[PDB]
Design a protein around this ligand. Structure first.
Ligand SMILES: Nc1ncnc2c1ncn2[C@@H]1O[C@H](COP(=O)(O)OP(=O)(O)O)[C@@H](O)[C@H]1O
Ligand SMILES: Nc1ncnc2c1ncn2[C@@H]1O[C@H](COP(=O)(O)OP(=O)(O)O)[C@@H](O)[C@H]1O
Ligand SMILES: [Zn+2]
Ligand SMILES: [Zn+2]
Ligand SMILES: [Zn+2]
Length: 576
């Protein structure tokens, strides 16, 4: 009942009872909260409510201190004082209170519903203490909203991978994609996709009629550590001990490795195929005695760091921390190993000489705080690319979230700039590099490869159907099918689109492996076939387009719906 104010850290006995997270607010910050918002319930050792029998007055602006108890205007004794007075709510430490000038930010964070991009902008431009309050409050809203969806019950099972579902009436249905993971009843986690639904479970299980699936609402724990520790700059490499000689394969990074050792935290922007994993593992080779924790939000990102480490680091010194199918070539759950590879959600409480946090565009401020709370490190290295994709914000429906508001690290990379930048793309044909360099990298990304002369574009609007909110463009797929008959080397291509439903139709008609742009991030393929499917904000987002066309190592075919993006592609145009 006694804590530190969320705005100014002053000691207080007050909490807002209307906020979902019930933050501490000092006497001065609490007044500015209740006097400007619909939040009028204040909590202390005892709740600020009228204590007379039968009275239901809970609005603190209508309550008075009489004796040691609280009463409304109709019940208060003659010798009383208002709880709200002199810009201050009565509590404890009323004289120590310092107040704050950012209460208008607090009030917006505390009262918003997280459906507007402007809510996320404020959550990333406020003070550090407010960033934590916003992250906790958003996550709580996301989890509680997951209870509003209807339950799905198995009516009949058609095969080992398809079934028919019944949906609870009166409640809305969750989208059927690989992002919405359901818990079965605990028969394990299940995902569904599109009559019949295709189902996928972590384990094979005999699914009976009546079994049900629900979205799993995770409880939300309070944050304590900042999203970024306060920065420090050192006069020399601190806590690290460089090798005498490093293999020339990594020598081009030595100046950046020295910079890592000379400040508390460092940021590295690495465009697609510029060597982010190579950099991260080279760090271990340059500081061979350093204990390094490699982390990221997704198992796929951790696994990729593992694959690189397997080639360059001693296998006996590595461990993959596993609470799905993860990398299996290291010892599992050996927390004490020199090199530990772990997703953020599974991090143990440990110390390290260096923490490497990869795929930073996909992190939220909640993730950044958890990493700092769990990992006490001498140095922190944030690796990623604000021109790539962010974590989905399930509640956001109004407005687009720009990269400078993805999280605290992306914000720094977009305002003051990254500490380090890998400027040579080694993966893609020059036609692609030149396109994305101008599109999102201010022309600073260089191509190592030549033009491939296997990069093609076609403008074809087609016909857009929809399966709920997922779009399908069958004519665009028909164009691809005709292209394949004439370009047989592309039978090994991967089909990519912004929409799951389009991928499902392409899979059936074309037979190629398919991937959504978002799922493709971090992967590379020789040949890519991309169908824009529609012209929407989703399908024209430059970050998403950047990711889509930089998957290719040799050739890409883009079937485009949007004239502006089509014209930017520095590809040979095809006719048909
Ligand atoms: N890999 C190493 N090579 C050489 N000297 C080391 C190494 N690791 C630690 N030391 C020495 O031992 C001291 C104690 O190590 P430690 O407690 O980790 O301090 P620090 O955080 O400064 O490395 C260091 O200050 C340094 O003088
Ligand atoms: N500075 C460098 N010196 C030598 N080889 C490099 C360098 N940077 C990258 N490479 C090579 O090119 C590859 C680029 O691919 P990758 O590291 O997966 O890029 P990213 O992780 O940024 O997608 C590296 O794995 C490595 O094989
Ligand atoms: Zn409140
Ligand atoms: Zn305060
Ligand atoms: Zn009363």
């Amino acid at each position: 009942a006694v804590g530190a104010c969320v705005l100014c850290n002053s000691q207080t006995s007050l909490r807002c009872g209307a906020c979902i997270r019930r933050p501490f607010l000092c006497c001065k910050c609490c007044y500015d909260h209740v006097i400007s918002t619909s939040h009028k319930l204040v909590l202390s050792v005892n709740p600020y409510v009228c204590n007379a029998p039968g009275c239901d007055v809970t609005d603190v602006t209508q309550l008075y201190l009489g004796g040691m108890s609280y009463y409304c205007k109709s019940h208060k004794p003659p010798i009383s004082f208002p709880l709200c007075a002199n810009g201050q709510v009565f509590g404890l430490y009323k004289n120590t209170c310092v107040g704050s000038d950012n209460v208008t930010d607090f009030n917006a964070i505390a009262t918003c519903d997280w459906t507007n991009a402007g809510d996320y902008i404020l959550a990333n431009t406020c003070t550090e203490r407010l960033k934590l309050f916003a992250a906790e409050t958003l996550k709580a809203t996301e989890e509680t909203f997951k209870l509003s969806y209807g339950i799905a019950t198995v009516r009949e099972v058609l095969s080992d991978r398809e079934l028919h579902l019944s949906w609870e009436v009166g409640k809305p249905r969750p989208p059927l994609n690989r992002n919405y993971v359901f818990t079965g009843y605990q028969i394990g986690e299940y995902t569904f996709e599109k009559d019949a639904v295709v189902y996928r479970g972590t384990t094979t299980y005999k699914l009976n009629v009546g079994d049900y699936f629900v979205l799993t609402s995770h409880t939300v724990m309070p944050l304590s550590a900042p999203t970024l520790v306060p920065q420090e700059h050192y006069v020399r490499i601190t806590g690290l001990y460089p090798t005498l000689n490093i293999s020339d394969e990594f020598s081009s990074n030595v100046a950046n490795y020295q910079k890592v050792g000379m400040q508390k935290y460092s940021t590295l922007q690495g465009p697609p195929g510029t060597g982010k994993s190579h950099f991260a593992i080279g760090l271990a080779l340059y500081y061979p005695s350093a204990r390094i924790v490699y982390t990221a939000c997704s198992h796929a990102a951790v696994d990729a760091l593992c694959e690189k480490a397997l080639k360059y680091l001693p296998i006996d010194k590595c461990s993959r921390i596993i609470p799905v199918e993860c990398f299996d070539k290291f010892k599992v759950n050996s927390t004490l190993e020199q090199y530990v590879f772990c997703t953020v959600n599974a991090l143990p409480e440990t110390t390290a000489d260096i923490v490497v946090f990869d795929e930073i565009s996909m992190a939220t401020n909640y993730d950044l705080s958890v990493v700092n709370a769990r990992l006490r490190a001498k140095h922190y290295v944030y690796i990623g690319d604000p021109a790539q994709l962010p974590a989905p914000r399930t509640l956001l429906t109004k407005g687009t979230l720009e990269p400078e508001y993805f999280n605290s690290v992306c914000r720094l990379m977009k305002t003051i700039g990254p500490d380090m930048f890998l400027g040579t793309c080694r993966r893609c044909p020059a036609e692609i590099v030149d396109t994305v360099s101008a599109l999102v990298y201010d022309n600073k990304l260089k191509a190592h490869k030549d033009k491939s002369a296997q990069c093609f574009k076609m403008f074809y609007k087609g016909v857009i159907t929809h399966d709920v909110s997922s779009a399908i463009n069958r004519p665009q797929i028909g164009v691809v099918r005709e292209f394949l008959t004439r370009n047989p080397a592309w039978r090994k291509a991967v089909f990519i689109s912004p929409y799951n439903s389009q991928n499902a139709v392409a899979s059936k008609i074309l037979g190629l492996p398919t991937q959504t742009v978002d799922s493709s991030q971090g992967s590379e393929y020789d040949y890519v076939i991309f169908t824009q499917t529609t012209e929407t904000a989703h399908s024209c987002n430059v970050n998403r387009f950047n990711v889509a066309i930089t998957r290719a190592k040799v050739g890409i075919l883009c079937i485009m719906s949007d004239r502006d993006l089509y014209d930017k592609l520095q590809f040979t145009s095809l006719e048909i």
